Amino acid sequence: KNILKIRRRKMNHHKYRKLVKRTRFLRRKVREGRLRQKQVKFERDLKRIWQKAGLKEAPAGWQTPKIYLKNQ
């Protein structure tokens, strides 16, 4: 009966958790790896604007904070 659907899920979940334990630190890399792409693409997004709006420098008092890498 419908348990037979749940069994599949139950297994697929278990078999996933196990995986994410072994793979943990590999995972941890690739997460942060993409956060450093994010923050960069983000930056370029704004850089694009100065250069598109004709300004040479980034406007006064702009440090362009890091949102994605926010921790603690």
Partner RNA sequence: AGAGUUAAAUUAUAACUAAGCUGUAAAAAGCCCUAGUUAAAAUAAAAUAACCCACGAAAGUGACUCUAAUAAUCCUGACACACGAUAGCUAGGACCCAAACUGGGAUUAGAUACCCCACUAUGCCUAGCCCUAAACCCAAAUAGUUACAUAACAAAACUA
Q: Where does this chain bind another protein (CB under 8 A)?
A: 42, 45-46, 49-50, 53-55, 59-62, 64-65, 67
Nearer to Mg ion, 7 or 48 (CB): 7
Give the alpha-carbon dihedral of 15, 20, 22, 27, to 10 degrees.
150
User: What's at 49, amino acid-wise?
Assistant: I
The distance of closest approach from Cβ of residue 19 to Mg ion in the complex, given in angstroms and rounded to an integer, is 12
The distance of closest approach from Cβ of residue 2 to Mg ion in the complex, given in angstroms and rounded to an integer, is 13
State the helix-helix crossing angle for 3-22 and 24-53, rounded to 10 degrees: 80
Among 6, 19, 49, 69, binds RNA (CB under 7 A): 6
Sign of CA dihedral 37, 40, 42, 48: negative
The distance of closest approach from Cβ of residue 1 to RNA in the complex, given in angstroms and rounded to an integer, is 9
